[PDB]
Structure 1
């Protein structure tokens, strides 16, 4: 017995995995927001970023943006440029959207 949440997650993720791009996964808790860029072919995380790791502070949206910018900076350092956004169970909106926009401002390609 799966949940709307679980189905929704599988649905958007399966679609992403088919394209074979590096996958930018985003986890959003009530307090924090997390991103890891994943190689689903080797099943390994390449680069990571979070509000919990950066000790970010303020408004959740503005924070999200910043963790996005951060993820970008580290990513570009490893030669990671093109990526596919994994909104998972979340609408593309608000905090997730902000992180996405922050990733793009950093020059992550998507």
Structure 2
């Protein structure tokens, strides 16, 4: 009850502070946010001048058939990079979205980095 509620509350507070520390995204340099469920892994690129998701990816996508490991998110970030290049976006701001930059997120981010995306 109260313990789960306060865990949620802490997550929200962290999320909000992160958001206004990094600022909003613009069509030139939109914002990349992630979400880490118990099963999957989601990423969205958002332009807040419109509230529009320019691109997105997740491990639910059957064709990718990745898992939920460091290796899998490496490949997933590769796919995201190749999907964004054809929509000619190279600058992104990395909203860690209430998580700690470590492990899976670290591998995701570095994978977007080796392939010419400025985060």
**TM-score (norm. length: structure 1):** 0.88
1:27 to 26, 35, 41: 35
Q: Is the 8 A contact 2:91 2:118 kept in 1?
A: yes
Tell me the distance in 2 between the aligned counterparts of 1:42 and 1:76: 20
Deviation at 1:76, TM superposition (A): 0.8
Match of 1:98 in 2: 107
Q: Which residues in structure 2 correspond to 1:7-18 (within 5 Å)?
A: 7-18=13-24
What are structure 2's unaligned runs of at least 5 residues? 1-5
Deviation at 1:18, TM superposition (A): 4.5
| 1:107–1:51 distance in 2 versus 1, CA, 3 Å | same
**TM-score (norm. length: structure 2):** 0.82
Tell me the matched-pair count: 109
Structure 1 runs of 4+ with >2 Å offset:
17-21
2:54 is equivalent to residue 42 of structure 1: no
Higher relative contact order (CA 8 A, sep 6+): 1
2:26 is equivalent to residue 51 of structure 1: no
What are structure 1's unaligned runs of at least 5 residues? none
